[PDB]
Amino acid sequence: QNLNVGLIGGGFMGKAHSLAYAAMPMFFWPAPALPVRKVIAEANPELAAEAARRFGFENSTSDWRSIIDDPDIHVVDIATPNHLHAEIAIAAAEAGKHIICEKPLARTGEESKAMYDAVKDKNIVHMVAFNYRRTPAVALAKKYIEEGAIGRILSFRGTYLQDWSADPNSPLSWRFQKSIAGSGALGDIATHVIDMARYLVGEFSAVNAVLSTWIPERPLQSKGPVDVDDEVMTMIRFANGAVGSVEATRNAHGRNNYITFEIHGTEGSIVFNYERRDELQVAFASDQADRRGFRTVYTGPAHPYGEGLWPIPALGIGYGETKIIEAHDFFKAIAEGGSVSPSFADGYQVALIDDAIVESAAKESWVDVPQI
Amino acid sequence: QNLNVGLIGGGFMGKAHSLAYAAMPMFFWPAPALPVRKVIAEANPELAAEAARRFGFENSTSDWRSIIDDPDIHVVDIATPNHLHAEIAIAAAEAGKHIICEKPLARTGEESKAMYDAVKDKNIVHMVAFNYRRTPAVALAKKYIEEGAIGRILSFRGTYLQDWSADPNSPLSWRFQKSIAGSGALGDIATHVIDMARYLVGEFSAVNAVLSTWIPERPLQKGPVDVDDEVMTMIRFANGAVGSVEATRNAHGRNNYITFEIHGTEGSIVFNYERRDELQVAFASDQADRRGFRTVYTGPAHPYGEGLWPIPALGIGYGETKIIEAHDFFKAIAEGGSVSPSFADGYQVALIDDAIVESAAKESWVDVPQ
Amino acid sequence: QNLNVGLIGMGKAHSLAYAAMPMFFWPAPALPVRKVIAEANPELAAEAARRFGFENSTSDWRSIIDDPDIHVVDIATPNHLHAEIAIAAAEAGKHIICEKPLARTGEESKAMYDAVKDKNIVHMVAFNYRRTPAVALAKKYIEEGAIGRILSFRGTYLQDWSADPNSPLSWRFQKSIAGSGALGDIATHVIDMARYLVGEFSAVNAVLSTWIPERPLKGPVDVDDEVMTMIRFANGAVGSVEATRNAHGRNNYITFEIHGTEGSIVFNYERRDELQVAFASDQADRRGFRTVYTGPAHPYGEGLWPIPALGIGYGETKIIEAHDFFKAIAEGGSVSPSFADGYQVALIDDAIVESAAKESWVDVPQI
Amino acid sequence: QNLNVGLIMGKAHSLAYAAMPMFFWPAPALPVRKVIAEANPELAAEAARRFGFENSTSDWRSIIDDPDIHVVDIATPNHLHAEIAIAAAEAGKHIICEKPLARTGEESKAMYDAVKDKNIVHMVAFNYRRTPAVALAKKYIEEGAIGRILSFRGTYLQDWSADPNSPLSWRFQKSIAGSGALGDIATHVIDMARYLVGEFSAVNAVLSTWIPERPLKGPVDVDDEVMTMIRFANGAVGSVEATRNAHGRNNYITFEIHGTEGSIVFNYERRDELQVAFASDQADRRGFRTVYTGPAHPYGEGLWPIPALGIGYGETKIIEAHDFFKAIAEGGSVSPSFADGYQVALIDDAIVESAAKESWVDVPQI
Ligand SMILES: O[C@@H]1[C@@H](O)[C@@H]2OC[C@@H](O2)[C@H]1O
Ligand SMILES: O[C@@H]1[C@@H](O)[C@@H]2OC[C@@H](O2)[C@H]1O
Secondary structure (H helix, E strand, O other): OEEEEEEEOOOOOHHHHHHHHHHHHHHOOOOOOEEEEEEEEOOOHHHHHHHHHHHOOOEEEOOOHHHHOOOOOOEEEEOOOOOOHHHHHHHHHHOOOEEEEOOOOOOOHHHHHHHHHOOOOOOOOEEEOOHHHHOHHHHHHHHHHHOOOOOOEEEEEEEEEOOOOOOOOOOOOHHHOHHHHOOOHHHHHHHHHHHHHHHHOOOEEEEEEEEEOOOOEEOOOOOEEOOOOOEEEEEEEEOOOOEEEEEEEOOOOOOOOEEEEEEEEOOEEEEEEHHHOOEEEEEEOOOOOOOOOOEEEEOOOOOOOHHHOOOOOOOOOOHHHHHHHHHHHHHHHHHOOOOOOOOHHHHHHHHHHHHHHHHHHHHOOOEEOOOO | OEEEEEEEOOOOOOHHHHHHHHHHHHHOOOOOOEEEEEEEEOOOHHHHHHHHHHHOOOEEEOOHHHHHHOOOOOEEEEOOOHHHHHHHHHHHHHOOOEEEEOOOOOOOHHHHHHHHHHHHOOOOOEEEOOHHHHOHHHHHHHHHHHHOOOOOEEEEEEEEEOOOOOOOOOOOOHHHOHHHHOOOHHHHHHHHHHHHHHHHOOOEEEEEEEEEOOOOEEOOOOEEOOOOOEEEEEEEEOOOOEEEEEEEOOOOOOOOEEEEEEEEOOEEEEEEHHHOOEEEEEEOOOOHHHOOEEEEEOOOOOOOHHHOOOOOOOOOOHHHHHHHHHHHHHHHHHOOOOOOOOHHHHHHHHHHHHHHHHHHHHOOOEEOOO | OEEEEEEEOOOHHHHHHHHHHHHHOOOOOOEEEEEEEEOOOHHHHHHHHHHHOOOEEEOOOHHHHHOOOOOEEEEOOOHHHHHHHHHHHHHOOOEEEEOOOOOOOHHHHHHHHHHHHOOOOOEEEOOOHHHOHHHHHHHHHHHOOOOOOEEEEEEEEEOOOOOOOOOOOOHHHOHHHHOOOHHHHHHHHHHHHHHHHOOOEEEEEEEEEOOOOEEOOOEEOOOOOEEEEEEEEOOOOEEEEEEEOOOOOOOOEOEEEEEEOOEEEEEEHHHOOEEEEEEOOOOOOOOOEEEEEOOOOOOOHHHOOOOOOOOOOHHHHHHHHHHHHHHHHHHOOOOOOOHHHHHHHHHHHHHHHHHHHHOEOEEOOOO | OEEEEEEOOHHHHHHHHHHHHHHOOOOOOEEEEEEEOOOOHHHHHHHHHHOOOOEEOOOOHHHHOOOOOOEEEEOOOOOOHHHHHHHHHHOOOEEEEEOOOOOOHHHHHHHHHHHHOOOOOEOOEOOHHHOHHHHHHHHHHHOOOOOOEEEEEEEEEOOOOOOOOOOOOHHHOHHHHOOOHHHHOHHHHHHHHHHHOOOEEEEEEEEEOOOOEEOOOEEOOOOOEEEEEEEEOOOOEEEEEEEOOOOOOOOEEEEEEEEOOEEEEEEHHHOOEEEEEEOOOOOOOOOEEEEEOOOOOOOHHHOOOOOOOOOOHHHHHHHHHHHHHHHHHHOOOOOOOHHHHHHHHHHHHHHHHHHHHOEOEEOOOO
């Protein structure tokens, strides 16, 4: 089963998605379906054609509407900035195409809602690309939790710390522009952590939060106001009684892609650091008193997704393997006419949480999360 | 000069203090003053004798009033549970004695006030035992900060995570009893973190917190647990910086996990007490291609180095923190100067705690009673 | 622009490079074509072709040399067949990459060197790990004198995948086919790192070992499980290297620790995104190993991920290979870890074998 | 009872005596800082008040000749190691003795001979091997928990003498010290190997020196860095390496031990941690466990009530002391004994020769 993909957007993500479509069958064999890089769309025809040569798409187009309207495209992948996710995804749904959309699902909850509405009664597979939950080490922690190996979860600390724009001479790209992005650190990076909280712990009841802009204007390369958050911190109460906290910032010198978490359970703990993604740290309370401690577990054949990755632990998981796994699960769901997680349902829930964080920060009070 | 010490209590903080006295001048020489282990109080006379023999005091007693009524006693050291801090220090105050008291200062901010009031206007050195601040790494952090080497502080994340009581069959000690501890994690370990925040970032403007009790009853020596196992709080600092503090007793694999991460405009600092000897600092001024966290091991080139070990990583333990603390306490007495942190700092911490509890109850931002 | 490839054969790793090389490094030196692939029979070879996405397949590997429309040959066979395929491919004027170790022995390897040394072809051995961005950064550091002149060296490669005696007796455990054990399999990658970072070897003295005598199919192992050699370098530096298969808790632990006159470097491939660099010129109160995450600012970083610690995996390593290999071809220059390097290493292996025989130091036929 | 000590780096030992009973209690024997010696009567008096001795002296002889004292403790450079040890032994004095035991094994012989026939409680200060983490390794091993030992790596990397303008102290002078790194530091690793595996049967090494002249500028005549391989008497193979010219390493005493059914790793820059990987872990959760030392672990009965409250150099020597004073008050032996001390010295000479010619060299195994 060969599926033609139409990739919309050929920036950093275009390359990550193309990589996965190229590589995924080499990894997961026999593959549930073969990706075909059939057509890539970009802002103008020279870029489109150049992106296609670079990523190995057969065709190219200056209009994505060309892809939605082409009946032999089975999969629309949306790798555009956050302002185009909804319009393209709703056209794709109406055209009955299977859809993977990059995060955040959209700019607001209300806009994420329409995308969900347009998809939820169709007979298509819809996905949002929170690829980090498919880091093997994160699946491994999920396995540990679900098999009861750390007891009931008490507590969750999560972070996403970067510094790529800590320098205020960094320009005012779309990530800093509210009307395109919807939010700053919150939508761009905190959403990956929120998804991990949801996957590993469970649903959010309420949030109580603080948003900070540290660099309120930047040069307009290619002096503009930064009307989004640079940093977010929020306390969380979970439906299942767990408590927790998330912190994300663009302004943490010495932190590059420091997605982490620490889960405290009644019978153990789990710690994850994406800058060292090959590793999961786990402490079992049932260890013998003189050999109790976090053990560092390197992922490989023995761990979730091991079958289709590298032959020994620590041969090296990179960004690209997270996207290969994602694609595997997506195309598997299509091949077997099932659903995948996280879906637009998961996407819309994250957008509601985000809105509840913004709300909470304006009112400076606990705000209950709407549960879809 | 030979200052005589009246130690009240010889428990888990029995050998800690007594080591400090015994060893301080060995380390920092010439010494400001020689601590003399004069007398130690415990609850019963046999217990006290046992203690004095062990901790190498000259004398002992069962009544702590004895100590405060002796005019030979230059220094009182309070290492009792939290229910007796106040009454002893207020008495010791009147007796004109120098005081060092364990944390938390008292069970509440009302009880802490008294103690503060009782030393305010008296001409005596008063110290509260937030010893972890005097880990060299944390002094080295203070150094970089106030040097301006990491710029203006944006953010503070601090933790004190433990697991000694994570097992529910762990018995109901005083630390789990509200009326004698005052509070749980908040008092017993959060207070260490709060102080480091006050020390490295500055004063608390306001807090918004959650307290949690996971194991609500424990076997007796079963009885209820009417205190804090875990505390989560966000913070507004008086200086614009934001941050958060998190402490627990129910974190499997966390033993003495006092950490912080500070984010400045020009750099970052990371500390982990489970590896005391190290401080992580990351400078923006580094060349693009050799920029990241540098792991500095502490020794002669760092604060308090001159009177610790001759090379970095020969190793800093719990005892050294107490040695450095003693030195600074006695150097203050010797100079008729003063010391940080004092009962003013302890009182402040007790207000932050009260505001935290008040916050958790109201599920609201509370302004810290400055 | 379009070089046709003929892979013959962990053949996914190579196929990923060819698929993915132009996505990363763009403009591409030359667009690779997965044209043909050979395996031990035509069904497996047709399986391989569907999985790894080659246009065409064969069970007879001579076919691919015999084809003139090929350009590149990629030898991912076990260790007994490198030279046969290498020599044959050389005579056909074929651009070549071959896996490590170059062959079972130095002599076997000598052939391969001569076959190519004369010809008009880019030739390469598959020391991919040296193209880990962190290791390439550690070069940038050493070559600008930033660590001064190199004194000492401690490379390792500790694995544990056959530390169970019940792990079966595959080909990597037969001198017949593997040549050596840990020495040729993995120690070979560290020896190349030594050469690329400090310099040429001068003499070595070694204790080969075997902890697993028999493994199931129950037959004998007739190769080294573990090797430590001591080293004197041409430049005057000192060093030691220790590669094993029997270190429980070690998976793909490729360590090095260089000591220079103005600094140090440590590397751990298990955390390959990091290099640790300690500079003596650091203010004395803020001096120590600093942890550098590789990214755009560092070597090969312009055509990898847009931010550090987004993650480098085994694959990007091989991607950078395919980039430099094809870069050599499309220009006409030459790629470093060549058969020369393969041959030199094979000799170091021979020396090391000798050393553990003669319980003494053994100079190294520098070439 | 009160075992009066005579203390001929000096603040570490004094700390031990002062502190050791409040740690381990009921204590085995309450030490007395009774006499301290040193270069001259000024330094001695100064040192005596600092480290809280009852008396001082400028002649070490006087301490031997004083039959009120119970214990000698040598803390001088290597040149003065021998002529004190014998005298103290003849005098029938209990002994501790800063490593290395002597500038040469030649000399060390006498020191063992002098002791062993009389039933002295006698020791050499290999303090690191009583870091609780290393004790926990011994316990793991002894228990079989990592099965049989196969291989061994050990290190001592330092950088204090890594700037050439660093002064020509007594550790770069052959006649005084005897060995540089080999005997100043590499000796500690040797002791660990000997303790966690077994005896050395043969050795090969390379000595190296990177800074020949220093300010005092005189000439440096000793080994800056030493690299050696090992064959253990039980089959195991090994490596030992130490240097003074390793920028970024401060006090980096380390080992990695591969067992049949596990591995153990130690980094003294983080003494509180032992890293153990048990092969018997389930396959989806297998790897190095970082264990923080506390009550559950060895020596934990008399240290801090919580793991990671923190172990420093001092605690190391408080254990060294309580073992010794435990060995006097019950009368048995103590490892590492002068025996252990001499073996190390022999091992050290083998290494000297090993490097000398460039071939392997058996270890005269006592
Ligand atoms: O999702 C992406 C992350 O992997 C990383 O963080 C910033 C940018 O790159 C973000 O859009
Ligand atoms: O034995 C001592 C070591 O613990 C340490 O390293 C140098 C010096 O201090 C040495 O004499």
